[PDB]
Amino acid sequence: PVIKVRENEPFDVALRRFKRSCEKAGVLAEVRRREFYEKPTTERKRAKASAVKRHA
Amino acid sequence: RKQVSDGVAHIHASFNNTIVTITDRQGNALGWATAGGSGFRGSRKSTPFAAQVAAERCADAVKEYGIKNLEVMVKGPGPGRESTIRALNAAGFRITNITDVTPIPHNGCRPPKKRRV
Amino acid sequence: PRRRVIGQRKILPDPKFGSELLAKFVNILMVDGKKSTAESIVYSALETLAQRSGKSELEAFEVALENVRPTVEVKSRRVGGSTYQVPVEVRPVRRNALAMRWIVEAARKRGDKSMALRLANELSDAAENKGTAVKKREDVHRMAEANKAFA
Amino acid sequence: EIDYKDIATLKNYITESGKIVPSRITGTRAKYQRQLARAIKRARYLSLLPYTDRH
RNA sequence: AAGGCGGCCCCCUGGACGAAGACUGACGCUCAGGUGCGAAAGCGUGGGGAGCAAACAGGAUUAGAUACCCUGGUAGUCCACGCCGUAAACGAUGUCGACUUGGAGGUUGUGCCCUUGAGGCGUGGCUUCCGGAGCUAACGCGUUAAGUCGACCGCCUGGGGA
């Protein structure tokens, strides 16, 4: 999520672009996912539940 | 206390606190300020306002160095990720780059156990 | 009001000066529906608070209100299991209401002889940026500055 | 016919941070997606591609 | 086969599937006892030990808190070789074979056609969801049956005691 503030752009648009890039990279979701241990059965059950609810 | 005009703003945005450290291009720290050291303890410490005032006080700890253009390296999931950047830009600083350097292990060490709260 | 959107009642202007501010001040100072008793107090206080300064009456009253009017106050909130105090911006009508209520409670908490004298002294203190009404306004602003992080 | 030496083609299937893009985004077959993942890992080993945007 | 298996590379190696043929000619299915494999924890010997973390210590919370929460932390988790032989070892559904309307997908071969196209049309293997007859106490299963049958095996006979 490297953001180089190019010329003739205000700071606010650069900050919003940085946020958009860091959310499309998914770094916050990953660092929130990795802070506690999730058992293999727990992650398998969660993936199965997510795949089941992705049917509508 | 000489003139740098080229710095880096290392923001350590943890869940419980926010640490802002302004170093030169090489990595030698010139000044630092935290949310807990700015008059905020407990619930007020993990807020974007505390991170903002910490970035304000850290920008004052480097006024003797005369920094004009400085980089931003955000690290951590906690609040104050963008609040410190806004407080640094408002302090008369030319933000040249913003970079997320949050450490991501490629499935390395085992994290602690889940909290049964 | 769970669903009730409510209008506004017609407050009559002051008989002596023709101000709605003074009418609401008399309403706030009134007890037991004794409007004639409160109007005499307010008029005596405004007269006594007129010769002292020199800017008539209504002007002195507004000058006293300007120093007691709070810009921001805290609202208690129970979200994180503890006392959250979010500083909210006060509306102008609520601003005047708070200022007048504080001035009245400060004048009633005085040791002068009559309520007219207490009011005159409280308003003169407020114009001089001192007293217990200004004290309460600074207390509120202090409490808001302390919890600014919770906006 | 996916070759780990074809960095010009491999760079189309990695993000700006060097991570492999999922097959749902590019709509490539599962078989050729597996071949692409193997080729990208091999090219990362040969230092032809970056592991991350840091290093 | 199950338990399980997740960076990349090399060496050894098992099974499955498909196309067109050639070959043997019932050589098959199931299987008490028997043997082998069998998550995690645990045990023995010798290593290793970053992170995590039974036991343990302290700080909290509480009426108490030998717990949840916090700060540490030993065995263990890791490797080699043996033992253990148990799991909600689950599809709570033994294996093998035949027959019975469909729909949408996934994955992996193969064939045909100005291949128009990342195309269309067939034909196998495995696999996910819905659903028809039928079956079921119902829930539901439904060509991967819990439908209609055949072969063999294991098991059940009220709840506790157990």
Side-chain angles (χ1 to χ4, degrees):
Chain A
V2 177
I3 287 298
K4 260 193 167 296
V5 192
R6 298 176 293 261
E7 202 40 53
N8 309 355
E9 321 160 321
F11 160 76
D12 219 333
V13 306
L15 186 66
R16 269 182 275 100
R17 208 220 319 172
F18 161 75
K19 309 214 311 262
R20 278 200 281 103
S21 162
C22 80
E23 301 142 38
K24 80 148 41 64
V27 299
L28 295 174
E30 206 76 343
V31 299
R32 284 193 249 104
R33 176 214 104 184
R34 296 178 176 273
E35 65 170 331
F36 293 131
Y37 186 63
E38 215 190 37
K39 294 209 305 170
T41 170
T42 307
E43 62 144 29
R44 276 187 268 117
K45 172 171 64 69
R46 194 181 42 80
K48 182 63 57 215
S50 94
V52 163
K53 79 158 75 95
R54 286 198 260 104
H55 238 210
Chain B
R1 313 148 319 288
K2 70 306 192 183
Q3 272 55 36
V4 198
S5 77
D6 255 358
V8 177
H10 291 107
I11 314 170
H12 181 88
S14 148
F15 276 122
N16 284 325
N17 200 341
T18 298
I19 304 177
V20 187
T21 291
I22 288 185
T23 87
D24 59 332
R25 305 286 308 188
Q26 279 67 68
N28 315 358
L30 317 167
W32 63 268
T34 60
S38 309
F40 298 94
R41 300 302 306 178
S43 172
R44 293 184 312 150
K45 203 211 319 168
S46 57
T47 54
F49 174 77
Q52 167 189 306
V53 59
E56 288 177 10
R57 287 171 36 95
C58 167
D60 173 273
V62 299
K63 63 176 293 295
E64 258 68 40
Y65 286 88
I67 303 182
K68 308 333 190 153
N69 294 26
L70 92 171
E71 202 207 358
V72 184
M73 291 206 174
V74 198
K75 159 184 299 179
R81 283 180 44 92
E82 75 142 71
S83 177
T84 60
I85 312 182
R86 289 182 170 271
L88 285 165
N89 175 252
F93 274 152
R94 180 173 246 286
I95 308 297
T96 76
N97 289 337
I98 315 177
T99 300
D100 189 316
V101 302
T102 321
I104 288 289
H106 299 356
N107 249 40
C109 280
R110 176 163 175 157
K113 54 177 188 165
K114 202 87 61 177
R115 299 174 70 242
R116 299 185 299 279
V117 286
Chain C
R2 195 136 245 175
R3 55 170 145 221
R4 286 199 264 149
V5 198
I6 55 262
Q8 266 307 332
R9 38 182 91 264
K10 182 107 92 213
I11 183 162
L12 290 188
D14 189 72
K16 193 175 179 183
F17 301 101
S19 189
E20 311 294 331
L21 264 184
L22 280 180
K24 181 130 258 164
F25 195 63
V26 174
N27 275 0
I28 288 177
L29 191 125
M30 167 178 50
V31 303
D32 303 326
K34 290 199 165 188
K35 188 96 78 64
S36 35
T37 304
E39 253 154 14
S40 318
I41 292 172
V42 170
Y43 289 152
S44 326
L46 281 196
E47 180 179 1
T48 324
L49 182 87
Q51 32 128 30
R52 306 218 205 152
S53 32
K55 30 160 72 116
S56 184
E57 283 108 318
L58 258 173
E59 299 171 24
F61 178 63
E62 211 275 342
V63 163
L65 287 195
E66 251 305 270
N67 293 333
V68 197
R69 211 130 57 195
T71 33
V72 46
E73 69 169 329
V74 283
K75 273 183 22 193
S76 212
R77 191 153 179 255
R78 198 42 38 80
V79 174
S82 308
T83 162
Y84 263 107
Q85 313 249 71
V86 172
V88 287
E89 184 222 49
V90 183
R91 291 239 53 183
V93 42
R94 176 162 176 76
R95 249 177 264 189
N96 280 324
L98 281 183
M100 290 189 270
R101 185 195 309 151
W102 292 350
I103 290 190
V104 189
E105 49 166 90
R108 298 198 259 222
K109 272 145 49 51
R110 279 187 84 107
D112 309 337
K113 282 306 179 60
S114 64
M115 187 54 190
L117 225 220
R118 295 157 149 178
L119 245 188
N121 299 334
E122 202 49 66
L123 291 171
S124 59
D125 281 332
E128 227 280 324
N129 207 286
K130 53 185 186 184
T132 42
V134 179
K135 177 66 221 140
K136 181 149 185 48
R137 193 215 74 241
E138 303 213 10
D139 282 319
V140 172
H141 280 172
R142 293 182 183 174
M143 203 156 337
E145 279 149 88
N147 300 87
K148 197 161 197 172
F150 296 140
Chain D
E1 288 176 349
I2 300 159
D3 187 23
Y4 68 98
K5 296 180 245 65
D6 194 7
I7 318 294
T9 301
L10 291 183
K11 283 172 183 168
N12 301 331
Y13 303 96
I14 70 181
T15 80
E16 293 177 350
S17 50
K19 315 167 63 177
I20 315 174
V21 305
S23 147
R24 47 179 184 97
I25 267 68
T26 52
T28 168
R29 287 99 154 175
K31 178 179 166 180
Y32 304 106
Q33 174 67 26
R34 296 188 301 260
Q35 299 183 2
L36 269 159
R38 282 195 290 264
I40 287 169
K41 290 162 178 168
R42 295 188 218 193
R44 285 170 176 174
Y45 177 80
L46 295 174
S47 170
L48 308 162
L49 276 178
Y51 275 96
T52 59
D53 51 342
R54 310 267 66 90
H55 285 123

